[PDB]
Design a protein around this ligand. Structure first.
Ligand SMILES: C=C[C@H]1CN(Cc2ccccn2)C(=O)[C@@H]2CCC[C@H]1N2[S@](=N)(=O)c1cc(Cl)cc(Cl)c1
Length: 107
């Protein structure tokens, strides 16, 4: 599944609700710590619509547990990410993924 560990607290009031656009900065790492992607590198926040499944399961379930402003670590088992196949060119087979996610805003 997805384990969510707080790095720094959010507002403790406002969580992502189904259908909202969730706006974050993230860095994604393999379990050995090698970075594979960051929205900070693109200088552009990442947005996704909660419930639309435009992101992996562990993001849908994990980021929903964050309150606005919060920074957390999400640790995601392969079955809640890209599984046995992994993802061509970026994610190895059977990869547990760790993401640093800061929840910036909801729209
Ligand atoms: C860049 C957008 C996302 C891509 N997806 C969905 C996705 C969409 C297209 C292909 C593969 N996966 C995702 O579900 C996750 C979580 C949200 C941030 C990022 N990824 S990611 N694990 O950082 C990532 C980043 C990159 Cl450049 C490629 C891949 Cl195959 C996966």
């Amino acid at each position: 599944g997805v384990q969510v560990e707080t790095i720094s607290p959010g507002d403790g009031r406002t969580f992502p609700k189904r259908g909202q656009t969730v706006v974050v900065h993230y860095t994604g790492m393999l379990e050995d710590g090698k970075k594979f992607d960051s929205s900070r590198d693109r200088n552009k926040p990442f947005k996704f619509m909660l419930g639309k499944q435009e992101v992996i399961r562990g993001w849908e379930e994990g980021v929903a547990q964050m309150s606005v402003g919060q920074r957390a670590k999400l640790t995601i088992s392969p079955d809640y990410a890209y599984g046995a196949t992994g993802h061509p060119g970026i994610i190895p087979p059977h990869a547990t993924l760790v993401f640093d996610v800061e929840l910036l805003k909801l729209e």
